[PDB]
Every structure is written in structure tokens, then in C-alpha cells.
A paper describes a structure:
The six trimeric tailspikes (above) are bound to the lower sides of the tail, and a single trimer of the product of P22 gene 26 (gp26) forms a long “needle” that extends outward from the center of the base of the tail. The N-terminal, virion-proximal end of the gp26 needle forms the exit channel plug that traps packaged DNA in the virion. The long shaft domains have a three-strand coiled-coil structure with 11–16 repeats of heptad amino acid sequences, and the N-terminal 27 residues fold back on the surface of the coiled-coil in the P22 structure to form what may be the site through which the needle binds in the tail channel to form the plug. We report here the X-ray structure of the C-terminal domain of the phage [name] needle ([name] is an E. coli P22-like phage with an Sf6-like needle) which confirms the very unusual feature that this protein domain binds three L-glutamate molecules.
The [name] tail needle (encoded by locus_tag EcHS_A0316 gene) is characterized by a virion-binding N-terminal domain 98% identical to that of Sf6, and a shaft-forming coiled-coil helical region predicted to be 210 Å long that is only 67% identical in sequence to Sf6. The C-terminus of the [name] tail needle contains a domain (the knob) that is 99% identical to Sf6 in sequence. We cloned the [name] prophage needle’s C-terminal knob and nine residues of its coiled-coil helical shaft fused to maltose binding protein (MBP) after polymerase chain reaction (PCR) amplification from E. coli strain HS DNA. The globular [name] needle knob folds into a homotrimeric TNF-like fold, very similar to that of the Sf6 knob (rmsd 0.137 Å). The trimer is built with three identical subunits each displaying a jellyroll topology characterized by seven stacked anti-parallel ß-strands. Like the Sf6 knob, the [name] tail knob structure contains a phosphate ion bound at the distal tip of the knob and an L-glutamate is present in the electron density at each of the three dimeric interfaces of the homotrimer. The phosphate ion makes polar contacts with [name] needle residues S266 and N268 near the 3-fold axis at the distal tip of the knob. Alteration of these residues in Sf6 knob did not affect the stability of the protein. The conserved triad, S266-R267-N268, is present in all the known needle knob sequences from P22-like phages; however, although R267 (its side chain points down and is involved in intra-chain stability) is universally present in all the proteins aligned in figure S3, the S and N on either side are not conserved in proteins encoded by the non-P22-like phages, so the bound phosphate is unlikely to be a universal feature of all of these proteins. Although not surprising given the similarity of the two proteins, the presence of the bound glutamate molecules in the [name] structure is consistent with their being universally present in the P22-like needle knob structures.
Numbering used by the authors:
A (entry chain A): 164 to 317
B (entry chain B): 162 to 317
C (entry chain C): 165 to 317
Amino acid sequence: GSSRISALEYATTRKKSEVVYSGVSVTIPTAPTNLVSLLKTLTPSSGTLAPFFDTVNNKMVVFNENKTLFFKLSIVGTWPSGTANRSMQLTFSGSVPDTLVSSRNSATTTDNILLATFFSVDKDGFLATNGSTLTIQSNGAAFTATTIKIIAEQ
Amino acid sequence: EFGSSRISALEYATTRKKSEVVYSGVSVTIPTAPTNLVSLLKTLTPSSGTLAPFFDTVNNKMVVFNENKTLFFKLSIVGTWPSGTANRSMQLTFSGSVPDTLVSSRNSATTTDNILLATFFSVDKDGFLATNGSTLTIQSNGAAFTATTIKIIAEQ
Amino acid sequence: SSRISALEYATTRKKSEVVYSGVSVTIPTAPTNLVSLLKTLTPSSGTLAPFFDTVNNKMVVFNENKTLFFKLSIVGTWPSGTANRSMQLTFSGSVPDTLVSSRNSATTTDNILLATFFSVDKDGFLATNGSTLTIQSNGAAFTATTIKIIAEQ
Ligand SMILES: N[C@@H](CCC(=O)O)C(=O)O
Ligand SMILES: N[C@@H](CCC(=O)O)C(=O)O
Ligand SMILES: N[C@@H](CCC(=O)O)C(=O)O
């Protein structure tokens, strides 16, 4: 069945946004900050925010499919020298909001960050209709990001 | 050949199976002692979703389909530790051939108490998870935690 | 016929899942090539091949537009009394990724679970170069007694 086969091929084709900002100086402040708003002003080194990051409404958006979305944010940067307790926090709005935190303390010298998660998108569900506002906040002190890689795939 | 049967099998293979359960507007203590998570949740009435088929409420464990398909797990908890709690963490252990221990730790720099634990389990046909399931044991560290919304997902 | 067989390939998981049991392995406080460390140990089950290259001491991937999922589960210990402590794992790449599992006095368990994914592109950086995995223990060295490592694609 060519039509059923084509549907299976579509279902098993990864769709994604994978955007790299190399050589930027993005301050991630200590106050809640819309992440897409922060990124959309920057010229990417590679990739595009579309289709998963909507630069008009400053949100992550998804395809209307019963297919899970995988998300990763990799940040190279620094907190100020001497900052001990510190964390990077990223919240996704949703029916139940999800709050990611990468915390560290005096024991860890590296300031680089890797946040990863997934969203089990339902057809005609909350994410499919509303998208998700991503709100980022640096805790302990402001963070200065010099490379950012952001991925959403479904 | 077996074309028809193989297409139907592929349709099954690419259909997500899931439990996605939300408990909204609750007030649930996650204590500092090890607590069977399924035992804790099954006392609550879901606002949406069902524990079946991934959470066995007789044996109080997560169970999986016997197929070479990875299971993705997420636990999202809205709640609080007592005011002033500085060092604190939420931990979740899954029994297995090698047990896995998830920890979300934080300190004075982070004021939010909300928790997001996510992972995967690479289920093998006739393997440990498929044969035994996994006991999930949750524990709050620093002080007891009071959860007001819980969302739990297992999918395969 | 062939589109069906191709779909069967596309939807079949490929994996390395290696368990090292009953070991007492120091993960030092200095950067350490993880594949170099593991390949000295005898697995209780599984094989480093095909995802872990023990000649160049790196993770390697299939040259396919298919995401790789990675998990490292470690049973072990920091020295008694260690409060602030963390385990970190860096993957080289076009942009390197640094995973950190940190904890403090509130947490008693020392066991570690690091999980992530890599959105491999055909003929992309990972497919062309692989990834060097560098592990480091912070606060004090960590003694690992069971290690389970998974890469799947
Ligand atoms: N099923 C929810 C997402 C659940 C999740 O947070 O993964 C939705 O479609 O909006
Ligand atoms: N392959 C193991 C699971 C490994 C993992 O922890 O992901 C099983 O089938 O029980
Ligand atoms: N697309 C990148 C991987 C991106 C990631 O780190 O997930 C590659 O093929 O090398």
C-alpha cells in the first residue's frame, strides 16, 4: 500500500530546528526572560528558528501529530568569577508547566550548561494548539553565553 | 513478501503507547523517607489520564511492553519545600538490572521548588524490565516536599 | 517490497549497552577520556562496539538522519563526608555539550544518572568525526562500582 507506506515514511522522518549561535554575547539575566525573544534578534551561525521556534509570538510550537518532541539547549558561557551557588532555569508553559533546573555549587568549575527533555505532544492537545512559552532565568548572578545550540525535533 | 502484515506491523511499531496522568489541585507529601511512587499516586484520583497500562497498581511498579522499543519517562512536580530551605533535592530510583537514580538538586541560589525529572529506559525483549517491571522509589531531601500538581508520563 | 524493508531498518534500534559489575574504578578529578577508562574494564554484559571506538577512544555514530540516545548510570561513592560534589561529562561536537549532575549536603546517595540525545545528521559533524567523551569528578574523586553505558540509534 503506497499510501500507507508514504504515511509511515512521513511518521519516521525527523523534523527539526537546530540553531547554533557561535560568537555571541547574550546576557541571560537573573529575571525571567523569554528565550525566543532573546534569540530571535541574533544572526544564526547555522540553522533557523523556524519551524519549531516562532519569532512572532516568541514561543516553541509543534506539529499537530501524536509524536513526541525532543528538546536540547547547550550553552557555552560563564557566570562571574567567584560565583559558587548558581543555576540555569528554563520553564515551558503547558497544561502543567515544566521547570528544568541545572544547579551547581563551589565544587564545579565549569559554567557550561546542557538542558534536555521531551514533550509528549498529543494531536489537538494543549501544545499543538497553544505552543509553549520558554522562560529562562540565570540564578546566583547573570550568565554570559558565548555559544548557544538549541534543538527541537519531532 | 508478507507485505500487508509487515505494513500493519510497522504501523504498530510507529504508534506511541502512553500513560500520561495529571493530578491537579492536590496537596501530597513527598516525605524524606523512601516512598513507593506508585503507592503514593494510586491514593489520588487523576484529573486526567490513567495509570494503566504503564503503572501496575497491584504490585506498585512501572511495567513495560515486551518489545525492543525504548521507554521515555517524565515526572513534572509543582510544589514546595518549607520556607528557608536551602540545600534540597528530589530523588527517584528505578529498580533494574542496574538501578538508576535520578536526582534534581538545588541550593540557595534557586528559589523555584518545581521539579522535572526525565530519562529513558532501553527496554529489551525478554529483558529485566520486561520480565520484572521497575519499582519507583521517591524521596525528598532537606525537608519534606508538598506537591500540588503532579504530571507523570511513561511512553513506549 | 523494498520501501517496507527500508522502514523495518529505519525503525529497528541499534545499540551498545555495556555493564561493568563489581569494579572499583576511580573517576579522577582531572579530565579523563571515558572510553579509554572503560576499555580497561571487563564487561559483565554487552559490547562497546559499535558505538564506542576503542582505537580512537570516542563515541561514533551511524551515518543516518536518526537521533542517538545516550545514558550513563553509575553506582559508586564519593568519600564519606563529601558535601558539594558533582559528576560531569563533556561530548566534543560542533558545539560541545557538558552534562553535570551536582549535589550537596542534602543528598546522601552518590549514584549518578546522565542522559541526553544527539540529533545526528547524515554527513554531519558527529557522523564525520565522532565525539570524545571526557568525564571528571568534582569535589573529590569518585569510586565507581557498577557502570552501565548505553548509546542507541
Ligand atoms: N500531552 C501534552 C504534553 C505533555 C508533556 O508535557 O510532555 C500536550 O500535548 O500538550
Ligand atoms: N535493557 C534493560 C534496560 C536498560 C536501561 O536501564 O535503560 C532492560 O531491558 O531491562
Ligand atoms: N546535528 C549535530 C548534532 C547536534 C547535537 O548535538 O545534538 C551533528 O550531526 O553532529
